[PDB]
Every structure is written in C-alpha cells, then in structure tokens.
A paper describes a structure:
To determine the BV-bound [name] structure, hopefully in outward-facing conformation, to uncover the molecular mechanism of BV export, [name] E659Q mutant protein was vitrified in the presence of 1 mM BV. [name]-BV exhibits inverted V-shape homodimer and inward-facing conformation as well. The [name] full transporter binds two BV molecules simultaneously. Each BV molecule is sandwiched at the interface of two protomers. TMH1-2 from one protomer and TMH4-6 from the opposing one form a pocket for one substrate. Indeed, the interactions between BV and [name] can be divided into two parts: The hydrophobic interaction with one protomer and the hydrogen bond interaction with the other. BV contacts with residues on TMH4 (V322, V325, S326 and A329), TMH5 (F398, F399, T402, S405, N407, I409, and V410) and TMH6 (F439 and I443) hydrophobically. Two residues from the opposing protomer, namely S185 on TMH1 and N229 on TMH2, form hydrogen bonds with two carboxyl groups of BV. Binding with BV bring the two NBD close to about 13 Å. During the model building process, we unexpectedly noticed that two cholesterol molecules are sandwiched between two BVs.
Author numbering: 155 to 628, 632 to 724
Amino acid sequence: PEARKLLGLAYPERRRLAAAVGFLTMSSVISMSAPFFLGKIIDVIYTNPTVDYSDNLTRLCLGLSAVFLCGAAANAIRVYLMQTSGQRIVNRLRTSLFSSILRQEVAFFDKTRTGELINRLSSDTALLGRSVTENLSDGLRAGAQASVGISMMFFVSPNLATFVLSVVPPVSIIAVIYGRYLRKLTKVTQDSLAQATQLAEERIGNVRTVRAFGKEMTEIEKYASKVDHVMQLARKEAFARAGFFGATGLSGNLIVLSVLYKGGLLMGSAHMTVGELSSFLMYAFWVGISIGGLSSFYSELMKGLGAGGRLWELLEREPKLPFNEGVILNEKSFQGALEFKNVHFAYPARPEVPIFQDFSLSIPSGSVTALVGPSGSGKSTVLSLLLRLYDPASGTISLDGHDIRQLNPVWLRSKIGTVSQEPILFSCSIAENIAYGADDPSSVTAEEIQRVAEVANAVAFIRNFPQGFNTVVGVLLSGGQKQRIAIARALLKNPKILLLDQATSALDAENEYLVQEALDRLMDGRTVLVIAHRLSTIKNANMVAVLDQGKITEYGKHEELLSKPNG
Ligand SMILES: C=CC1=C(C)/C(=C/C2=NC(=C\c3[nH]c(/C=C4\NC(=O)C(C)=C4C=C)c(C)c3CCC(=O)O)/C(CCC(=O)O)=C2C)NC1=O
Ligand SMILES: CC(C)CCC[C@@H](C)[C@H]1CC[C@H]2[C@@H]3CC=C4C[C@@H](O)CC[C@]4(C)[C@H]3CC[C@]12C
C-alpha cells in the first residue's frame, strides 16, 4: 500500500520527474568520465613526450572544456526541476490535510491536542515531500558513482582493485556506526539540558510565590546541580568526538600512501603509468564517498515512510457527524418553538459523570424563559446541544415538530445565536471581528458596521483609538468593551433565536450601565433563553424553571413559586 500511495503522490509530476532523471543520468556520466581524460592528458605531457606535443594539449583541453559546459547545464536543470516538484507536492499535502482536519467533530478535538496537529501540518508534510523528490536524486547519484568506480578500477588494474576493495568498505561502515553512536550521546545530553531549562522556566514564571516563602536560594542550588550533571554528561561526547577525529584522519591519510606503495612496485605486464594511478585514486575516493552517500538515503527514506504513515490516517478518517448535509425549511415553517424530551447526556471525556437525565422543556415563540438553578451544574451544555455540537445518549431535540438530526447543521446554526460572558476575539481589526457574523463578510459596507456601533454603545470607546475601527485586537481591551463588541456581531447576524450566558461577577459601574442598555434591543422581538446567575432578570422573565439534579424539578412564573405556601 505504501508504494501505491507514493506512486499516487508522484503521479501529477511525472512529466517533470522523468526529465530530471534524464538530465541526472548525463551529468553523472560526464562526471565519472572526466578522470579517464585527465589521465590521458597527464600521460600525454609526461609519458614519453614527443618533439611537438603542444597541439594535442590544446585540442584535448578544448574538447574537455566543451564537455564540461554541457555537464553543468544538465546539473542546473536537474536541480531546478527536482526542487520544484517537492514544493508542488507539499502544497497539495498541506491543503488536503487542513481541509480534512477542519471538518471533523468536536469530540475528536476533545481527545486530541492542537500541538500534535500543528506538528503534523508543519513537519510531516515537509519530510514526506522531501523524501521522494530531493532524496531519490541523491540515492541515484550515490548508486551511479559506486558502480562505475568498481568497473573502472577492475578495467584499469585488476591487481590493485582487489587490494582496495578490502580496505575502504570496512572503514566506511565503522565510521557510520560511530557517527550514530555520537548522535545518540548528543541526544541524551540535549534531553538533560531541556529538563534543566524547563525547571528554570517554571521557577521564573512564578516569582511572587517564590519570594513569599523565602525560597530564592534553593532554586539556584538545584539549577546549579542540574548544570553540573549536564556538564558531566557532555564530557563523554567530547571524548567520543576526540576519538572519531583522531581515527578518521589517520585512516584517510594511510589509504593514499598504501595505494602509491602498492602501484609503484608493480613491474612487468602489471605496470601502471602516472595517469592510470591518478585515475585509480580518483575512482577509489568516489567509491568511498558513494558508500556514505548511500547510507543516508536509506535513513531518510525510512523517516519519510514513518511520516507518511503518520499522515495517512487523518486524511482517510471519516467524521462521525454529518457536515453540510440535510433538509431545510421555509420562513413560516419555524416559529421558534424548541422542545426537549427525555434527553440523556454525558461528556465523552468523562462518561462517568452524567449531566442530563429525563430532560423535558418547551419554549414557545416569543417567550423569555430563564433556567435559574444551582451554580456549577453545567447547565451551559444546553447551548452545545441546540447547535448540534454533540448528541444525546437517548432522547429527541425537535424544533417545530422536527428532530434536529434531520435538519442541515449549517442552516440551523444561522438561526440560533449566542452571547458569551468572555467573547473570544481573533487577531484582526475591530471591523473584521464585527463582519464575521454576516453571510458574506467580504461584501460588507462600512455603512452597516457604523450603524451597529451606536446601537451597541461601542462608538464611544472606539473613537479614542487612534486608528478608529482598524485597531487590531487579540491591542488590549477591557472586559466591558469585549461584551459590547460581541453584541455588534449578534446585531449584524440578525438571529431568530437567542441563547444568552450571563456573567456571575458584576462588571464595573460604567460597564454595568452601558452593557445593560445594549442588551435591551438584543432581547427585543425574538425567542430568548436566559441562563442567569443572579435574580436581577428573574422577575422580568415571562417564565422561570429550576434545574435540580439534572432535571426540571419545578416550573412556574416568578410569582407562582414565590406565592406558594413553602416560601
Ligand atoms: C574510508 C572512508 C573515510 C571517511 C568517511 C573519513 C572521514 C574523515 N576524513 C578526514 C580527512 C581526510 N580524508 C581523506 C581521504 C578520504 N576521504 C574518504 O572519504 C576516502 C574513502 C579517502 C581515501 C581514499 C584524507 C587524505 C584526509 C586528510 C586531509 C586532512 O588533513 O584533513 C577527516 C577530517 C580530519 C581532520 O582534519 O580532523 C574526517 C572526519 N576518512 C576516511 O578515510
Ligand atoms: C586521492 C583522493 C581520494 C584523496 C582524497 C582527497 C580529497 C578527495 C579529500 C581531501 C580532504 C577530504 C575531506 C576532509 C574531511 C571531510 C569531513 C568529513 O566529515 C567528511 C569527509 C571529508 C569531506 C573529506 C572528504 C575527502 C576529502 C575532500
């Protein structure tokens, strides 16, 4: 399956990968052919020179100069085409991943973390794209410079080919192994240092608590001890690197001298001229380079298949709730009547603790009901059940005689709005956080964004801002100012049903007045449900309901329960 998926990924760029491979082949050929011609020139100059050998020098040099230009052109074309293919692949990977991620259900985001998703979107896509394109060329080059070398060595001198084939490979393998060991040691040291840095950051973050308890020196001593541990760890890597650099240089130096000694004692039929010896030396180096070049190809390919395996379950995942599909209703079909019957619910994160049990509730058109009840019971979950973020274990949530499980979730969400105690604002201009509630924000005229600023009592504090409505918030804003901005979105949305969530703690005197006036027109001429924390709006509510033990224990008007004998 992995091979088929990789071929599918590479399919759109075949006409460009084929050309890249074709140019690579010629570049590699010309670069493995060069040493033969260099040896020919050297033998022309120094091996039994004739009376007039200058002409041949010029001719051969001109030929090689002509060849090198073509080689360079092929190399450049390969580089360009190989580097562009990977970018073209990674763009598509990034777009597809993001599109797949942004259409899941909310439970998936509850169990999963954002850091993992961001890491997969930032690094896995790069590794998978680079493994196929920018690594295949390196592997092909390494395989091309390891096969021609042996063939040429046996063509030139069979006697010295056997001797050289019994030295280099062992050294290269030992070097690669050692290097892996060094990498392991470095990783261990870095892990220890990261632990120390995390402790420092944690203790720096909370300084008031540290000073309150007279604990400023113990942290210093602990950090010092952690630093000594890190240094003791690093000494070993220092020793290992010293060994590597002491051994590899000697191994490299002794290889060149052995070939000269061996090829200088060969007399008779097995006699080599200077150019032949130079060619032999060049080919031996090339083979030695090739082995190390080949190892990295396998390493990077394995990492790339790992990254691809990590990526290839998010794209093929299937959402558990329907998105953008269902039925739609006319203008008069809905009057705003919401009916809840026998609802059972429990957060997926902690199924143990139940929240709603035998929940029945009716809200007629044009009626302001208040769900006043004990605090901390999580009655806010009703908002997440009307919007269709979750589903109940057992029950029905019907709107005008139809279960919301058959309605289009995107169309339903438009007709139901909300205002929160702590509105969440994006990193954008103030005007860009008010047009988010319109159907087409890209076609909103500033005439409108001005009308709702006065209605929401926002045009007062905005004017003080030097940039007016272009101020970027994410710029600090007051708690009471965030509210008045939120009502700006609600006014522009123009919902037919409103869900509200009041703040447990009263705001400032200035905010307690401006905010209240704005909400008066947001509760005018619409069906509204108020989850209140204080008895301020309880009297004005048309009806009131008390939620006890996740149930509608009592149902009565403001004076119905107050006038009862048990009071
Ligand atoms: C067997 C593989 C093999 C590997 C992977 C290897 C690794 C290293 N070679 C180094 C230097 C040299 N390399 C060569 C020639 C070959 N390089 C090769 O890859 C093959 C195959 C050769 C001989 C044909 C020579 C003449 C020198 C001395 C040049 C100088 O003075 O530096 C250094 C740096 C040394 C420092 O300076 O600390 C390191 C880490 N050594 C090997 O033999
Ligand atoms: C006759 C030939 C084979 C002798 C070798 C001469 C050339 C090819 C030598 C001279 C210096 C050498 C380099 C010096 C040190 C390093 C750093 C090491 O991390 C990789 C190998 C590398 C890059 C060596 C590769 C080969 C090298 C470039």
